[PDB]
Amino acid sequence: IQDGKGDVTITNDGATILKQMQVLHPAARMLVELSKAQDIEAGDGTTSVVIIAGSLLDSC
Amino acid sequence: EEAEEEA
Amino acid sequence: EGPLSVFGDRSTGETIRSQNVMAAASIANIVKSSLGPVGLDKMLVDDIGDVTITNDGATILKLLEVEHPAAKVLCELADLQDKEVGDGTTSVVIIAAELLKNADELVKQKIHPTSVISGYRLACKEAVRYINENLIVNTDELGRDCLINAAKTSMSSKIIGINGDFFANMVVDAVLAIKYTDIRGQPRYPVNSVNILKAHGRSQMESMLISGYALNCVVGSQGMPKRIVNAKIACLDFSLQKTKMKLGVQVVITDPEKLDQIRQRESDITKERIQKILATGANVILTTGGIDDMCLKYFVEAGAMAVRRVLKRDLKRIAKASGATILSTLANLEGEETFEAAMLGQAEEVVQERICDDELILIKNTKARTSASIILRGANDFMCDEMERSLHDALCVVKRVLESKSVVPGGGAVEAALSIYLENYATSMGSREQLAIAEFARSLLVIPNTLAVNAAQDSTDLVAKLRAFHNEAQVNPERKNLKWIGLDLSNGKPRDNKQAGVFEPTIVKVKSLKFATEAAITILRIDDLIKLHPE
Amino acid sequence: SLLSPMSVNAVMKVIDPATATSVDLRDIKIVKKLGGTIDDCELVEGLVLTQKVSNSGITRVEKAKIGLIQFCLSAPKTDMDNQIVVSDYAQMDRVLREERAYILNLVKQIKKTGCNVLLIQKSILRDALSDLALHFLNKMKIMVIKDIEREDIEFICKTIGTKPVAHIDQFTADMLGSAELAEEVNLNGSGKLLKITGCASPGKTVTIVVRGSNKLVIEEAERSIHDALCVIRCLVKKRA
Amino acid sequence: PVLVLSQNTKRESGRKVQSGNINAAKTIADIIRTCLGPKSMMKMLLDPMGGIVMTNDGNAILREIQVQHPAAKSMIEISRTQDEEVGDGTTSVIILAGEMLSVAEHFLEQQMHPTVVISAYRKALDDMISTLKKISIPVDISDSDMMLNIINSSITTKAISRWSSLACNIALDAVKMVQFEENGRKEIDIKKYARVEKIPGGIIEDSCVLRGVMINKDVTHPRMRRYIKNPRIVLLDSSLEYKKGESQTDIEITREEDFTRILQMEEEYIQQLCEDIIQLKPDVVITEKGISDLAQHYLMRANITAIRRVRKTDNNRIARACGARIVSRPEELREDDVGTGAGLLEIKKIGDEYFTFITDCKDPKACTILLRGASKEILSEVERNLQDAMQVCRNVLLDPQLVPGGGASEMAVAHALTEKSKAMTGVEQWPYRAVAQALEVIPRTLIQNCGASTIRLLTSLRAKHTQENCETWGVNGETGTLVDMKELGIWEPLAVKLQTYKTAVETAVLLLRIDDIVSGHKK
């Protein structure tokens, strides 16, 4: 990820990736909050939670 | 400086 | 395109991997043409016309401005190598770029990057372990010529190449004279404690080593003497201007008769301090702060030298070399202020000497310890700067060799032996890490190829000869001595490099391999890129 | 194979397994230091400081007595608007003599308790350590460390057992902490680092030094270690 | 959108870079090669500020030109390095460097690596130095006629050649009177104590050197004497006036008499200072700071002459000339700080302006050279020529060795290297001979500037040098013939030749090692 200022990050953490992006759709601004909540509660699984939520919303 | 010994 | 509104550009797939590999290859190709004794220099001009001439990889990469982070990684790699060791900042970049280039082909084949990474880690570990078999213990060799040969090999390919013996003798003398007596568990050799000065003028073979110290400063006033035979040195860390009351204090006068004595005391306090200092026989007074015109007269009449605006590091080195004690105030463990002849340095001579229309100060034969300085003469400023940069590498190399008594042959013998050994060792794994290990071994072979190419010779033939000799060494044990045949670039044929006198510290190879492998891994793990638009 | 035992040891050094129900991860501090490789990451059962010592000459002390200060070693200053008026030439010397004596008295009082290591917190309104005070402290052979942050005092006290002092009258030999070694190390080229090890009153704290040949690697390794710590914390919270 | 790696950086590499460097060096050499020898012509330069520089000096020519190619910058720098080191030979160095670098592309284009050429140059330089030391001649520094001959042969090329007898005497007297040895054994000839003053008008033959100093200053008050026979001089670094302190002091007065008493104490202080000065009974007071009206009144009552606001360097020169030393606090004034080595103090007018002369010193260690002439440009050129002569004299005094001029030394060194090269085998032989045969550009340029047949004269001179005892034969620059330098009388110091050769060879070595150029990286 390269920011607007010029800083560079290399990461595998799902919450970090989602925070470092700039998603614009309002429905996509709740997945980052969900990832942050999972990070606070458990500190792991920040990617699987988003995958599961996306799968359920797709199945709907 | 690396020289930071006795005094 | 479409979903995932990000307001930026994202790239995924083989595109980003190829782009990263190309960036690394371009960075390597910028500095590939300055490797080995037959390497040439580079000239750099900024936007205002200032000119720099150099062939030091770290300096070049620091002066260049780069926009690709994959290239900035290599730039910081070179900087880290320079900080950690001080020699070999051009070989590690080439090795890392070649490692990336060779791993990218295996990634283009359906090989997962994790297997490549594990193979690279295993190969690096095995290579580091094996390098501790090609070692040479410097005590076995005669110490002086071992050090001289290491220094000469370090200074080859620089502006001071032909004067290798002269400058190597100077460097070894300075390093030995600057040796420090520690707890005696290990002696220490603190380089950069030697002052290096530049002054254009006569030919470089008139650069001189000073047994003492050199100051880029001049005497305070023209009425003072400019040579002291037996020097008593007082180092001070405060100004000698007329006194001034602090911010909290103010003067209010209601009886006019009391103004004159206050105005007189203002100037009398500093005179009393100066008389206290001079009563002990001090001949030389060095001060970081300023000295007032009113206060220079006392030194002028007393017949003593005063130097102002001396740098703090210079004062520290002078004080420790001459045995003086640095004072930030004259107060003692009681109320009164005293200066004791016990805290004075002693020097065998202090002179002011003229060098090419300017002046400087020489302090000779300090008695508390030994100190050294170097004055470099050259055609002009560019030449002097390049000479200083080339001398720093030799100083660092000599320090490393003295600290760790182990040396290693140069010229590509190490790379050839490692390639042969890792190629043989790759079979015993019998897995997909075998391909990665073989790729590591083959990518280790770029140094002799670059040397031969820069020497305008037959790289393929020379490298084939080296591989054949090292294979015949790794088999048939009674011919182990063939593991030291390096490369001769002035003739185009192999030669026993340990006998010839081409040596390097082993820390250079070990650290270069470790850092190159780490950089290769950290760039090879990238899968996709997202760049955000500036606000 | 090197980072897992570090994480397990770090978590087990902070909690009491008999009755621990949750883990405070602010009791474990991660320090990032460039240079070297990840292989050089280490666990410190003591105190690590990133700033340098102001004392020129002293860098290693054995059997160290440590004290923490929350007042200033400088010229006297009242919180109201104060100012000294001079109307005769004797007062000019008298002021300097009195200030010198005032500083020397505090230095002697500090020396009376046997203190070897002094820590001073950050101050922004008045100078917390003057050149005269530093000169006297060096003459008394005491190592001085300055500009301790105002928000890690709790961690420092928890680690080394010291007690903050805000008045010289309370500087007593019972308010000091004892340590076995307190010294600064110089890494190859990255800089200096203060280490205090062998504390007589070991608290439930620990620190981790993370190395690396690149900043990207250092932050990624830090995040990985945080992930491991969080997993162990979850396993403590629920034994399943 | 634009993917870049190194933004707007221009890179060039290959044989193009080497050819460009050599061409730039040759162009720099070609600009100046008409200004060598007694038949040199002047150049007038127009500077950005609006002045004019009519000159013949190589460094003066080169430092007024702005260039873009870095090789040109390197040559411009080596010119001023030579000028600072020795002060003479700033054209021969440029010409020699140009030739030494021009004779290398022949071997570069024949696929020879530059390192071999560098090694050959560094090998030849030592044998050049050895031959130069071999053919040296000693000189006795007590032979004033020999010293004048050396200085005359040095200045026979510039515009003062019409007044060489005057110029040589001026330079010799100045250098001899400035020479100084002091505490310890530090011998020095610092030329910041030999001031030059240009005053337009009169005639050039009125130029002289004074036993003392001259300043552009006048008496503070008209009733002071303007002519003193045997004065006693005191120098001060402080101001004879009442000034505020610096301790942030205030005065609070609530009575009638305090204001007048405060106003009177200042006059009392001034009177005390003036009396303290008067106790030494001097005749002249010089100070770098101001002097108050009441102080002037008291000094005139005591029959003293005061001068205000002199520069620090002028004060130092006056101190060194009259034997006095500067004192900042009059209270600490002794009989040692009073200088009595003067012999006349005068104040004259030179064209509606006042000047102050302190002359007839017993033994001065500082001097002022006074130049008159047509105008500022002529006086500036005379000043530059005098600087050249004085630095040549100082070099001769610091190293008493001489070598023949006119190209005799160049041809002798070339012959020695050519003879020595036939004992060598390998590829280095060709560059080793190339440098030696490249040393002939100096006599060739001398012949060209004289206006004769270079092709015939150069081979005649080479044949003459091929004999045994002919190391002093050279070219006569005024006619165009071959003459033995012994009878002609052209000799130059050894230091100048050594510096010239070393600088030229090292510049060539530096410029032969470049391979690529990177431009436009914005710090």
Ligand SMILES: Nc1ncnc2c1ncn2[C@@H]1O[C@H](COP(=O)(O)OP(=O)(O)O)[C@@H](O)[C@H]1O
């Ligand atoms: N060695 C392994 N073999 C197979 N599955 C594994 C292995 N290690 C971890 N996993 C599984 O992979 C997932 C871990 O993915 P991870 O990148 O950690 O995501 P997150 O950060 O969301 O936990 C979990 O399903 C975990 O059980």
Ligand SMILES: Nc1ncnc2c1ncn2[C@@H]1O[C@H](COP(=O)(O)OP(=O)(O)O)[C@@H](O)[C@H]1O
């Ligand atoms: N005399 C020599 N013969 C062969 N190889 C040499 C010789 N001297 C140096 N080398 C090689 O030169 C290389 C060093 O490249 P260089 O640019 O000078 O330094 P670095 O890249 O290490 O900063 C090493 O591979 C070393 O073995």
Ligand SMILES: Nc1ncnc2c1ncn2[C@@H]1O[C@H](COP(=O)(O)OP(=O)(O)O)[C@@H](O)[C@H]1O
């Ligand atoms: N009368 C003369 N006859 C022949 N050659 C001379 C004569 N005077 C000077 N030269 C030569 O002219 C050369 C260059 O001197 P000049 O033209 O003043 O420039 P520079 O002194 O800066 O080299 C000297 O090497 C000297 O040998």
Ligand SMILES: [Mg+2]
């Ligand atoms: Mg995980």
Ligand SMILES: [Mg+2]
């Ligand atoms: Mg090197």
Ligand SMILES: [Mg+2]
């Ligand atoms: Mg001349």
